[PDB]
Design a protein around this nucleic acid. Structure first.
Length: 239
RNA sequence: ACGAGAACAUACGUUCUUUGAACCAAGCUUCA
């Protein structure tokens, strides 16, 4: 069928998709086009749908048969007045601005995408249930322990957004929203899998153990919002 | 004081006239 969609992202948090050209001043730069006008490349959305569908064992290989057909294009190109400076804060305990800043996209930015995919193995029947599955396990596998354990009253304007819509089609794109948003294997147990990836992570660095690892929300610059970043809403309409 | 003397097997004559090394064939597949 080649069912094309016009999906649109609205930003619940500050977002910074890599860039490569990146340097208390710490002046940063972002991915732009050749006209100096920012946009979001389609590989970010393809990685987000890789988190969505391929949440399984390590078969994410050149032998793959699903994601050669998922034809994600780029977006429309938005001017640079949709951009404010923001800060990095780690909400584990005693939340303080860490010295690692970024010039990033302003929240609630309307960006739209010409996303299409073939129907040989790919439908929205898969996308809907896979996104609800990944969202529900993003709470019940990692963030439920962050809700019940080592929780401070500063974070609870914050939207828990679980009674809102169970078919909300929510993804996570990689924008420095912790090293939990760049995962692939959460199936299907709670704490044995947690300690599994805990030694898998802690043989790559030197931290003393504590639960839970690293949750990175953000806020607004007195009005406060405690806006978690990395997540966005998607609509699915044809053409 | 030889069946012997003398006597170029020589002259003129394009290995030449025809015709495409063509047709068939995303540097692409998985990469936040």
């Amino acid at each position: 069928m080649k069912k094309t969609y016009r999906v649109t992202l609205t930003a619940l948090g500050p977002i910074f998709i890599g860039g490569g050209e990146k340097l208390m001043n710490d002046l940063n730069t972002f991915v732009k086009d050749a006209f100096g006008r920012p946009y979001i490349p389609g590989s970010s959305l393809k990685g987000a749908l890789r988190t969505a569908i391929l949440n399984d064992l390590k078969e994410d290989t050149k032998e793959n048969e699903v994601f050669a057909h998922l034809q994600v294009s780029d977006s429309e190109t938005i001017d640079l007045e949709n951009l404010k400076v923001y800060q990095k804060v780690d909400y584990s305990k005693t939340a303080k601005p860490l010295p690692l800043y970024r010039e990033c996209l302003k929240p609630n930015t309307e960006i739209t995408f010409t996303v299409s995919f073939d129907d040989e193995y790919l439908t929205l029947k898969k996308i809907q249930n896979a996104l609800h599955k990944t969202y529900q396990h993003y709470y019940i596998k990692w963030l439920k322990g962050g809700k019940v354990g080592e929780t401070l009253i500063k974070g609870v304007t914050f939207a828990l957004d679980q009674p809102s819509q169970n078919q909300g089609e929510i993804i996570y794109i990689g924008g420095g929203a912790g090293f939990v948003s760049k995962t692939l294997h959460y199936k299907s147990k709670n704490r044995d899998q947690a300690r599994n990836d805990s030694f898998d992570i802690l043989k790559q660095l030197f931290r003393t153990t504590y639960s839970k690892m690293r949750s990175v929300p953000d806020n607004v610059p007195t009005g406060k919002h405690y806006l978690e970043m990395g997540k966005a809403r998607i609509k699915l309409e044809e053409l």
